[PDB]
Structure formats: C-alpha cells, structure tokens
Design an enzyme around this catalytic site. Sequence first.
Site, PDB file in Angstrom:
ATOM      1  N   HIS A  46       1.089  -0.619   0.350  1.00  0.00           N
ATOM      2  CA  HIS A  46      -0.163  -0.520   0.156  1.00  0.00           C
ATOM      3  C   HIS A  46       0.935   1.721  -0.247  1.00  0.00           C
ATOM      4  CE1 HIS A  46      -1.832  -2.908   2.838  1.00  0.00           C
ATOM      5  NE2 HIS A  46      -2.440  -3.054   2.082  1.00  0.00           N
ATOM      6  N   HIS A  48       0.641   4.561   1.635  1.00  0.00           N
ATOM      7  CA  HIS A  48       0.155   5.657   2.948  1.00  0.00           C
ATOM      8  C   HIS A  48       0.317   6.711   3.017  1.00  0.00           C
ATOM      9  CE1 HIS A  48      -0.751   1.680   5.652  1.00  0.00           C
ATOM     10  NE2 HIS A  48       0.206   0.929   5.000  1.00  0.00           N
ATOM     11  N   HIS A  63      -3.612   4.017   5.088  1.00  0.00           N
ATOM     12  CA  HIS A  63      -3.967   3.788   3.706  1.00  0.00           C
ATOM     13  C   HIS A  63      -3.603   5.661   3.010  1.00  0.00           C
ATOM     14  CE1 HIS A  63      -4.135  -0.650   4.119  1.00  0.00           C
ATOM     15  NE2 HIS A  63      -3.089  -0.152   4.623  1.00  0.00           N
ATOM     16  N   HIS A  71     -11.617   0.730   2.601  1.00  0.00           N
ATOM     17  CA  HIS A  71     -10.083   0.179   2.160  1.00  0.00           C
ATOM     18  C   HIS A  71     -11.276  -1.353   1.007  1.00  0.00           C
ATOM     19  CE1 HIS A  71      -6.449  -1.839   2.300  1.00  0.00           C
ATOM     20  NE2 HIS A  71      -6.915  -3.487   1.517  1.00  0.00           N
ATOM     21  N   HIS A  80      -8.905   2.519  -1.356  1.00  0.00           N
ATOM     22  CA  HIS A  80      -8.203   3.945  -1.311  1.00  0.00           C
ATOM     23  C   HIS A  80      -7.359   3.905  -2.280  1.00  0.00           C
ATOM     24  CE1 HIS A  80      -8.728   1.934   3.733  1.00  0.00           C
ATOM     25  NE2 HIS A  80      -9.633   3.159   3.252  1.00  0.00           N
ATOM     26  N   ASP A  83      -4.550   1.366  -1.947  1.00  0.00           N
ATOM     27  CA  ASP A  83      -4.570   0.050  -1.740  1.00  0.00           C
ATOM     28  C   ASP A  83      -4.000  -0.340  -3.466  1.00  0.00           C
ATOM     29  OD1 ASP A  83      -5.925   0.383   0.120  1.00  0.00           O
ATOM     30  OD2 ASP A  83      -7.758   0.276  -0.601  1.00  0.00           O
ATOM     31  N   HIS A 120       3.489  -5.441   3.850  1.00  0.00           N
ATOM     32  CA  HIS A 120       2.880  -5.481   5.420  1.00  0.00           C
ATOM     33  C   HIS A 120       3.565  -7.079   5.351  1.00  0.00           C
ATOM     34  CE1 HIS A 120       0.604  -2.658   6.767  1.00  0.00           C
ATOM     35  NE2 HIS A 120       0.834  -1.718   5.072  1.00  0.00           N
ATOM     36  N   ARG A 143       3.940  -3.150   9.479  1.00  0.00           N
ATOM     37  CA  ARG A 143       4.988  -2.500   8.736  1.00  0.00           C
ATOM     38  C   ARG A 143       6.862  -3.044   8.210  1.00  0.00           C
ATOM     39  NH1 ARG A 143       1.963   2.971   9.330  1.00  0.00           N
ATOM     40  NH2 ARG A 143      -0.275   2.359   9.422  1.00  0.00           N
TER      41      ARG A 143
END
Lengths: 153, 153
Positions: A46, A48, A63, A71, A80, A83, A120, A143
């Site tokens: 993602h 962020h 995100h 999401h 998002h 995403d 992630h 993360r």
Amino acid sequence: ATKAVAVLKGDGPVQGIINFEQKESNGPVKVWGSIKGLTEGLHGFHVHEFGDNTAGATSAGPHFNPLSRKHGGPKDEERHVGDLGNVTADKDGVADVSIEDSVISLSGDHAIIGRTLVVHEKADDLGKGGNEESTKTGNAGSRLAAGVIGIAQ
Amino acid sequence: ATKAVAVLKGDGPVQGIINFEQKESNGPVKVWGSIKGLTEGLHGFHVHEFGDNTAGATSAGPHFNPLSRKHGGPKDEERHVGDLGNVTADKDGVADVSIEDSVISLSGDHAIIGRTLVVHEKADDLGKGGNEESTKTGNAGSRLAAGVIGIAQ
Ligand SMILES: [Cu+]
Ligand SMILES: [Cu+]
Ligand SMILES: [Zn+2]
Ligand SMILES: [Zn+2]
C-alpha cells in the site's frame, strides 16, 4: 514519461527497490521491482498517506485515501487510492513485483510522490474479512519495510 | 499550511531529522531540526533533484535547478532552487538547523516534495570560490547523509 522510486527498508531483513512509471499523466502507473527477505506468499502492499519515517513505517499514517473511501482491492471501485493489493514472494523470499494501476498517479494534487510505500507482514484480505479492520487496513498486519516515494529520472 | 519532513541517513554516523513548514503556498518555508555525527564546522545543505536513494545520496543527481541558474547561497538571486547554504555543527558534532527560505516551496510545479535533502562533508562556498566547481556544487564535497522529502501530517 514520469517516473518515481521507493527504497524499502525496515527493522528486519525485508528490503527492495520499487520503480513507478507513468507514460502519460492520464495513464496507468506501472509498478515493478524486487523485494527480498519476505516470507513465502502474499504480503499487503500500500501507499500510506505520509512520507514520514521519523518513527519508521509507523509514522506513515493510514492508507492514502484522498477520496475518503473504505479499504478494498485494487480492482474495486470502493478502495483507497493507496490500495495496491498484495505482492507475492516466492520460495526464496523474493517478490518480483509487477503491478499496473489506473488509480494511483505520479502527478496532480493526489500524487503518491512524497508519500510512503509499505509492504506488510500478512496478506491484504482486500476488504473481504467481514470486520471493521478489513475495510480499514485489509488485516495485512505490521509494516515490514517502507520507503518514501521520490521523483526519479 | 503544508508540512514535510526528511530523515537524513547515510553510510556513516551522520543522521538527523529536518522538518519543513509552509503557512501559505506563496510564502516562505521554515526549515528546522537537528543533524548529528558531523565534524565541527560548516556543511553544505541542499535539495538535490531526484528522490532516488537507490545508491544512497549519489543517485539524487545534482542540486535541484529547475530555473537553470548557477550555484549560489540561499540569499543570492543567482542560485539553484535547492541551494540552502550551510548548516553549522558545534564541537559535539550537532547542527541545530533553523532556516527560513522564500525560494523553495512545498507545493506547485517546482515543489521539493519527493526530492532529496543532502548534507555534505565540506563547507559550501556559496558559488564564490572562483572556480568551475564553485558555481556547480560550491565545493561542498561528498554527500554524508540524505533523505527523501516526504509529506508530513
Ligand atoms: Cu499498508
Ligand atoms: Cu548537495
Ligand atoms: Zn486501504
Ligand atoms: Zn547549488
């Protein structure tokens, strides 16, 4: 064309270089590169909101979500901007990332330039987990590595 | 207001956090923070063109120079947009940075967001050195630490 790059780093062994290319400002962004040190299988991937690495990936915020949606997976209309779904690491812990996305951009007031790319711990459930966290983070876990998305040539 | 941040890191002990804040899009940017691990004295301090950290600071390219001018100090009319002069390390190797600049911006088509902040090994001569290198780099020498300039909360 326009280009960007993020160097992913964290506290563990996960690291890589992800390239972004956008042939036309109205066009899809091609995302590619290699991430090593990952566990085999799916990992949430993602953009962020903040390009802030002062507390590591933690300071990157949620995100990137300029349209204030829930999401989803990259194929969903309800997603998002950040995403990008999952990337897949092979048996040797290497994700040879290859994504094309029509929602992210490298230009305009919603550009991902100066924001943070995060890979992630776990798979992104793409909003299909049946809980509130699924439609916020996709349940992708911690993360593992992050990098500020910079202008490249 | 608009805010940004750069976390400076390199191959050696030099590291720091530099914040940017701009109240109005046509107003000055306040630049402040701390850098440690430096030799006592003046160190060149610049925004370089690319936020490409794939080869650390080296891949950031030259001083950000969208207006195609010669190298100078921040208070010179003839300067690169990226020319933020020198920071000063005390006897303990700590530079406490407090700058205001009306040439850099955090927004618009020449924004420094997604570009690289670099601190150098030597003093920047601010383009007054009287050699070719002076009007290019200010003879600031090697790049000790760098960070991609990211959007902050
Ligand atoms: Cu994420
Ligand atoms: Cu420099
Ligand atoms: Zn999301
Ligand atoms: Zn310069």
